[PDB]
Design a protein around this ligand. Structure first.
Ligand code: ATP
Length: 153
């Protein structure tokens, strides 16, 4: 079979819980993270495998509720921000698109999948500390960077 599709299409959701008012005027926003069920036990947001016929954000949305139980209706996908991570995992480059999302519930339900055994809620520093992977450290980095350029929507 003469393959023609280069790399694998993926889509994740960079979730962030926005608190009411600021505390120490430093932090305020958090990020949802899902620890891998094996390997290096790295922490990454709900990423899915978007199909050519499937939508980009949807794959990231479904993956959210699939690997976190939270759907677009339970969060808030911020528009204007879009970045994808390209890298060959086992032996195939996966393109992971990331969208900023804010869960309406602070204690929102967290329904993970087989691909995730645990999750966490941390800011940029921590989300970056766990997501040792530079690519992710950036996704979460730009997230807070962009959101800080908006207002609330
Ligand atoms: N940002 C990244 N850049 C490059 N490689 C990464 C990045 N994040 C994770 N990886 C690695 O890429 C691989 C992705 O795992 P795999 O392709 O097996 O996905 P998966 O099937 O979604 O995961 P799982 O086995 O846990 O179900 C792992 O070895 C992981 O450590």
């Amino acid at each position: 079979g003469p393959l023609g599709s280069m790399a694998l299409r993926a889509c994740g959701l960079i979730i962030f819980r926005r608190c009411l008012i600021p505390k120490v005027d430093n932090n305020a926003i958090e990020f949802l993270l899902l620890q891998a069920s094996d390997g290096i036990h790295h922490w990454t947001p709900p990423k899915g495998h978007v199909e050519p016929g499937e939508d980009d954000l949807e794959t990231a949305l479904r993956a959210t509720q699939e690997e976190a139980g939270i759907e677009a209706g339970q969060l808030t996908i911020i528009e204007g921000f879009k970045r994808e991570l390209n890298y060959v995992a086992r032996n195939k480059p996966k393109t992971v698109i990331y969208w900023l999302a804010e869960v309406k519930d602070y204690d929102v339900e967290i329904r993970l999948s087989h691909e995730h055994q645990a999750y966490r809620w941390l800011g940029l520093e921590e989300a970056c500390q766990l997501a040792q992977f530079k690519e992710m450290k950036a996704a979460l980095q730009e997230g807070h960077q962009f959101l800080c350029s908006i207002e609330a929507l």
